[PDB]
Amino acid sequence: MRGSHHHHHHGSNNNGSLKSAPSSHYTLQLSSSSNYDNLNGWAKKENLKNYVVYETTRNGQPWYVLVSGVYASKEEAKKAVSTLPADVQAKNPWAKPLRQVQADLK
Known part of the structure; x- marks a missing residue:
């Protein structure tokens, strides 16, 4: 509503836990949205086989x-x-290098 600007809290690098994973692997995306409940509908609609909903x-x-x-x-x-x-x-x-999601993972 009012303000909206999160200060720095990452931009790290030194961890070694990066190369500790196969980046050569990729992972596209079926779709996008901003609602879990509403999503469940689609995911179940198109009957997406072999999949796991996560944050x-x-x-x-x-x-x-x-x-x-x-x-x-x-x-x-x-x-x-x-x-x-x-x-x-x-x-x-849109291509999404598996090396990206590496954010949440650590």
Whole structure:
């Protein structure tokens, strides 16, 4: 409502826990939104097979993103899209390097 500006609280680096994970792995996105209850509807609607709802980060605004396992690299990731239907492809699955979500994980 009034003010809205969170001061620094990260921008770290020295941890070594970074390279301690396979970044070569990628993970696209089926869709996006800002409501768990409402989401449950879609996720259940399209009948997303093999998936797990969890919390994460997305533009200083937590959201329940859905992803299917993990694609070896970006080579199979691109094609992976074709497999997905229109409804999912209509959301233009913007590439999301698994190295990103590394934020919540630590």
